[PDB]
Amino acid sequence: GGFSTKDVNDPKIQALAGKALQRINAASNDLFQQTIVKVISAKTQVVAGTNTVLELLIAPTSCRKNETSAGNCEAVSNGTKQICTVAIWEKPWENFEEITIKECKSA
């Protein structure tokens, strides 16, 4: 029917944000990896399989995508942060999980 607020520290919400980040980084024109600063919000609906919409606050790191960094990739002072709306759609009877990056914009 409609969306319901979900907790941004749910272990499943976190996993999903992580996956949405890999997707943002894989598809983004940026040469440098982005990292999640925080999950701003999370909300799920269940009309046809589960649809989860996340807002992620993300920052650039100094980890180049053209590389293989030695560890964690840490957010950097500037650091123009973005907010990306991401929709993740799950249909476990089709064994289906589709992550859609809906929009990113300057925050």
Backbone as JSON, one array per atom type, in Angstrom:
{
  "sequence": "GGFSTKDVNDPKIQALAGKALQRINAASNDLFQQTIVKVISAKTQVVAGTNTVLELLIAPTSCRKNETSAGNCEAVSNGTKQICTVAIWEKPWENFEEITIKECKSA",
  "N": [[0.84, -1.23, 0.0], [1.68, 1.42, 1.03], [4.64, 3.31, 2.03], [6.86, 2.43, 4.76], [8.74, 3.72, 7.48], [12.05, 2.88, 8.38], [14.65, 1.55, 10.36], [17.85, 3.02, 10.29], [20.01, 1.69, 11.22], [19.47, -0.97, 11.29], [20.68, -4.22, 10.62], [20.32, -5.46, 8.19], [19.55, -3.16, 6.61], [21.95, -1.65, 6.64], [23.78, -3.55, 5.23], [22.41, -3.53, 2.74], [22.82, -0.72, 2.06], [25.59, -0.77, 1.73], [25.84, -2.3, -0.51], [24.56, -0.71, -2.28], [26.33, 1.39, -2.42], [28.68, 0.16, -3.67], [27.49, -0.19, -6.14], [26.99, 2.58, -6.83], [29.65, 3.45, -7.05], [30.68, 1.75, -9.09], [29.19, 2.49, -11.38], [29.56, 5.32, -11.52], [30.96, 8.23, -13.1], [33.17, 9.37, -11.83], [36.63, 9.29, -10.98], [37.52, 8.61, -8.52], [36.81, 6.56, -5.69], [33.82, 6.65, -3.75], [32.5, 7.06, -0.43], [30.34, 5.98, 2.16], [29.08, 8.38, 4.21], [26.81, 8.65, 5.98], [23.79, 6.69, 6.41], [21.14, 8.44, 5.64], [18.23, 8.16, 5.49], [15.72, 5.42, 5.47], [13.31, 3.35, 4.05], [10.68, 1.05, 3.66], [8.46, -0.65, 1.43], [5.94, -3.07, 0.66], [4.3, -4.01, -1.41], [4.75, -5.41, -3.9], [6.84, -7.82, -3.7], [9.76, -6.73, -1.77], [10.36, -3.31, -1.61], [12.89, -1.16, -0.92], [13.85, 2.12, -0.1], [16.56, 4.16, 0.06], [18.36, 6.89, 1.41], [21.47, 8.06, 0.99], [24.23, 9.61, 2.38], [27.11, 10.6, 0.89], [30.71, 10.7, 0.49], [33.72, 11.85, -1.31], [36.72, 9.86, -1.55], [40.27, 9.24, -1.25], [40.92, 7.04, -2.67], [41.61, 5.72, -5.64], [39.71, 4.66, -8.34], [41.06, 3.35, -10.29], [42.76, 1.55, -9.2], [43.93, -0.51, -6.49], [43.37, -0.31, -3.47], [45.03, -0.38, -0.31], [43.33, -0.64, 1.96], [40.63, 0.42, 4.12], [38.66, 3.05, 2.8], [38.91, 6.3, 3.35], [36.77, 9.14, 3.89], [37.26, 12.45, 2.72], [38.25, 15.77, 3.62], [37.52, 17.92, 1.65], [35.94, 16.61, -0.91], [33.31, 17.4, -1.48], [30.36, 16.37, -0.68], [27.67, 14.09, -1.55], [24.15, 13.42, -1.87], [22.43, 10.55, -2.42], [19.66, 9.01, -3.66], [18.52, 5.78, -3.58], [16.99, 2.85, -4.73], [16.12, -0.34, -3.78], [15.05, -3.43, -4.9], [13.52, -6.36, -4.16], [12.73, -9.72, -5.0], [12.29, -12.62, -3.87], [11.31, -15.04, -4.85], [11.88, -14.99, -7.55], [14.46, -15.14, -7.28], [15.57, -12.57, -7.22], [17.28, -9.51, -7.09], [17.33, -6.24, -7.47], [19.16, -3.32, -7.68], [18.67, 0.09, -7.96], [20.11, 3.13, -8.71], [18.78, 6.14, -8.12], [19.03, 8.91, -8.22], [21.76, 11.03, -7.71], [22.9, 14.02, -5.94], [24.45, 17.19, -5.29], [25.18, 17.84, -1.95]],
  "CA": [[0.0, 0.0, 0.0], [2.5, 2.61, 1.19], [5.94, 3.13, 2.64], [7.04, 2.51, 6.2], [10.06, 4.12, 7.97], [12.78, 1.73, 8.81], [15.78, 2.05, 11.11], [19.05, 3.07, 9.45], [21.03, 0.82, 11.84], [19.13, -2.35, 10.96], [21.82, -4.9, 10.01], [19.95, -5.61, 6.79], [19.62, -1.86, 5.93], [23.38, -1.43, 6.45], [24.17, -4.44, 4.11], [21.89, -2.96, 1.52], [23.53, 0.56, 1.76], [26.91, -1.17, 1.31], [25.73, -2.8, -1.86], [24.17, 0.42, -3.13], [27.59, 2.1, -2.61], [29.41, -0.51, -4.72], [26.82, 0.17, -7.37], [27.28, 3.98, -7.16], [31.03, 3.55, -7.46], [30.8, 0.99, -10.38], [28.53, 3.26, -12.42], [29.89, 6.76, -11.46], [32.1, 8.79, -13.91], [34.23, 9.85, -10.96], [37.8, 8.41, -10.91], [37.79, 8.29, -7.09], [35.79, 5.9, -4.89], [33.03, 7.39, -2.79], [32.25, 6.28, 0.74], [29.11, 6.39, 2.83], [29.16, 9.08, 5.49], [25.73, 8.05, 6.75], [22.51, 6.42, 5.86], [20.21, 9.52, 6.09], [16.95, 7.5, 5.77], [15.43, 4.09, 4.93], [11.89, 3.08, 4.13], [10.31, -0.14, 2.9], [7.13, -1.02, 1.12], [5.81, -4.51, 0.43], [3.2, -4.27, -2.32], [5.15, -6.49, -4.81], [8.19, -8.03, -3.18], [10.14, -5.61, -0.91], [11.05, -2.15, -2.12], [13.57, -0.32, 0.05], [14.42, 3.35, -0.64], [17.57, 4.68, 0.96], [19.08, 8.1, 1.1], [22.82, 7.9, 1.47], [25.12, 10.75, 2.3], [28.38, 10.0, 0.49], [31.84, 11.62, 0.29], [34.86, 11.29, -2.05], [37.89, 9.37, -0.79], [41.42, 9.34, -2.15], [41.09, 5.77, -3.29], [41.33, 5.83, -7.03], [39.06, 3.5, -8.93], [42.02, 2.71, -11.16], [43.74, 0.95, -8.33], [43.57, -1.5, -5.54], [43.77, 0.28, -2.22], [45.45, -1.19, 0.82], [42.4, -0.79, 3.06], [39.45, 1.24, 4.18], [38.83, 4.26, 2.08], [38.34, 7.34, 4.2], [36.22, 10.41, 3.41], [38.24, 13.51, 2.74], [37.77, 17.13, 3.92], [36.71, 18.34, 0.52], [34.91, 16.46, 0.08], [31.95, 17.67, -1.88], [29.43, 15.32, -0.36], [26.43, 13.98, -2.3], [23.02, 12.61, -1.39], [21.97, 9.66, -3.46], [18.48, 8.19, -3.48], [18.73, 4.44, -4.1], [15.88, 1.92, -4.55], [16.44, -1.72, -3.92], [13.86, -4.21, -5.15], [13.73, -7.79, -3.97], [11.7, -10.71, -5.28], [13.05, -13.85, -3.56], [10.82, -16.15, -5.68], [12.61, -14.9, -8.81], [15.81, -14.97, -6.81], [15.82, -11.31, -7.89], [17.57, -8.31, -6.31], [17.69, -5.17, -8.36], [19.52, -2.02, -7.06], [18.55, 1.24, -8.86], [20.5, 4.47, -8.22], [17.69, 6.94, -8.63], [19.6, 10.24, -8.45], [22.68, 11.7, -6.75], [22.99, 15.45, -6.13], [25.3, 17.9, -4.32], [24.71, 18.2, -0.65]],
  "C": [[0.86, 1.26, 0.0], [3.76, 2.32, 1.99], [5.94, 3.17, 4.14], [8.53, 2.72, 6.63], [10.75, 2.95, 8.57], [14.02, 2.31, 9.47], [17.1, 1.92, 10.35], [20.2, 2.24, 10.02], [20.66, -0.67, 11.79], [20.29, -3.01, 10.18], [21.57, -5.18, 8.54], [19.98, -4.27, 6.01], [21.08, -1.5, 5.65], [23.99, -2.23, 5.25], [23.69, -3.88, 2.81], [22.58, -1.64, 1.1], [24.93, 0.24, 1.17], [26.87, -1.56, -0.14], [25.37, -1.65, -2.77], [25.42, 1.32, -3.4], [28.46, 1.49, -3.72], [28.8, -0.21, -6.08], [27.08, 1.64, -7.77], [28.7, 4.08, -7.7], [31.3, 2.92, -8.83], [30.29, 1.77, -11.59], [28.97, 4.75, -12.57], [31.06, 7.1, -12.4], [33.33, 9.22, -13.13], [35.39, 8.82, -10.99], [38.03, 7.89, -9.51], [36.56, 7.61, -6.46], [35.12, 6.88, -3.97], [32.8, 6.47, -1.58], [30.98, 6.81, 1.35], [29.56, 7.16, 4.07], [28.06, 8.56, 6.44], [24.52, 7.68, 5.9], [21.56, 7.48, 6.45], [18.82, 8.93, 6.42], [16.77, 6.15, 5.06], [13.96, 3.85, 5.09], [11.53, 1.95, 3.18], [8.81, -0.19, 2.62], [7.12, -2.46, 0.63], [4.58, -4.82, -0.39], [3.53, -5.39, -3.34], [6.59, -6.88, -4.59], [8.54, -6.82, -2.29], [10.86, -4.54, -1.72], [11.57, -1.24, -1.02], [14.19, 0.93, -0.59], [15.31, 3.93, 0.44], [18.04, 6.02, 0.45], [20.4, 7.96, 1.78], [23.52, 9.22, 1.32], [26.5, 10.2, 2.02], [29.44, 11.08, 0.29], [32.93, 11.0, -0.56], [35.92, 10.81, -1.11], [39.08, 9.65, -1.67], [41.78, 8.01, -2.82], [40.66, 5.89, -4.74], [40.69, 4.56, -7.46], [40.0, 2.71, -9.82], [43.08, 1.97, -10.4], [43.23, -0.24, -7.57], [44.15, -1.09, -4.2], [44.05, -0.71, -1.12], [44.48, -1.29, 2.01], [41.04, -0.14, 3.0], [39.72, 2.45, 3.33], [38.13, 5.38, 2.8], [37.94, 8.65, 3.52], [37.26, 11.49, 3.62], [37.59, 14.89, 2.88], [36.96, 17.78, 2.83], [36.9, 17.48, -0.72], [33.56, 17.03, -0.23], [31.1, 16.43, -1.75], [28.22, 15.28, -1.34], [25.41, 13.22, -1.5], [22.44, 11.86, -2.58], [20.76, 8.95, -2.89], [18.65, 6.88, -4.29], [17.49, 3.61, -3.74], [16.39, 0.5, -4.77], [15.18, -2.59, -3.87], [14.17, -5.67, -5.09], [12.52, -8.68, -4.2], [12.3, -12.08, -5.12], [12.5, -15.12, -4.25], [11.36, -16.15, -7.1], [14.1, -14.9, -8.55], [16.4, -13.62, -7.26], [16.15, -10.17, -6.88], [18.11, -7.29, -7.25], [17.93, -3.84, -7.59], [19.54, -0.9, -8.11], [19.07, 2.5, -8.17], [19.61, 5.45, -8.9], [18.13, 8.35, -9.03], [20.63, 10.41, -7.37], [22.74, 13.24, -6.99], [23.89, 16.0, -5.04], [24.55, 18.2, -3.05], [25.69, 19.21, -0.08]]
}
